[PDB]
Amino acid sequence: NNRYSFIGGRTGQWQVVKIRNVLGPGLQLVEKVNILNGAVAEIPLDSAWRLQGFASNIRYAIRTELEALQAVQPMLNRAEAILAVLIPIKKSAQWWEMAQDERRDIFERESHHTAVGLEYLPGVARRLLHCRDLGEEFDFLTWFEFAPEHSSAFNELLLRMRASKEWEYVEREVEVWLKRL
């Protein structure tokens, strides 16, 4: 199954450390996030919100970028990676109406998204889900996990991304910080 659901409420494998409502309307604070590998129609009891999205194909990265990523990126579920951060993102209509070269140019040529992210590997593990195509309020669910040592670096990475040309098209962002139970 390529579909993943994230349920904020009173149960789950993760503990909410904090939520930062960076841009746009925020998400309600909850005790825990429950993550599932399937669609969930039945909104669980004592749960404030459901996010969902699917794993998909590459949309921007070229072969050499892929090769570079594969050489250093860590797997998920390292025993040390006890911290995680869920970051929903929505981009603007002006971004989506742009052609594929335009988007590619802003993504790597101007914002160096891959080159910058590579500096934070192997400390940081990541998963990218898509959800615009499902009719969700956000376009993307981004997932990061790392050991505490790397929390500082990760905060540094967030502030760099937010300074890029790419982030000018971002109209909604929340940080959910998590600790594995």
Which residues of this chain interact with its own copies, rule CB under 8 A? 1-3, 54, 56-63, 65-66, 96, 98-102, 104, 130, 132-133, 135
Asked if 59 is part of the footprint of ligand HEM (rule: CB under 6 A), the reply reads yes
Kindly state the smallest distance separating residue 143's Cβ from Cl ion, in Å: 9
Binding residues for heme b: 59-61, 91, 113
Is the CB of residue 140 less than 8 Å from the CB of residue 88? yes
Q: Residue 40: what residue type?
A: V
Question: What is the distance between the alpha carbons of residues 53 and 178, in angstroms, rounded to a whole number?
Answer: 19
Binding residues: 59-61, 91, 113
Long-range interactions of 128-132: CB distance < 8 A, separation 24+ = 128/55, 129/4, 129/52, 129/53, 129/54, 129/55, 130/53, 130/54, 130/56, 131/51, 131/52, 131/53, 131/54, 132/90, 132/96
Kindly state the smallest distance separating residue 20's Cβ from its own copies, in Å: 28
Asked if 92 is part of the footprint of ligand HEM (rule: CB under 6 A), the reply reads no
- Summarize as ranges the residues that interact with Cl ion (CB under 5 A): 128
- Summarize as ranges the residues that interact with ligand HEM (CB under 6 A): 58-61, 87, 89, 100, 113-114, 117-118, 120-121, 124, 126, 128, 140, 142, 144, 157-158, 161
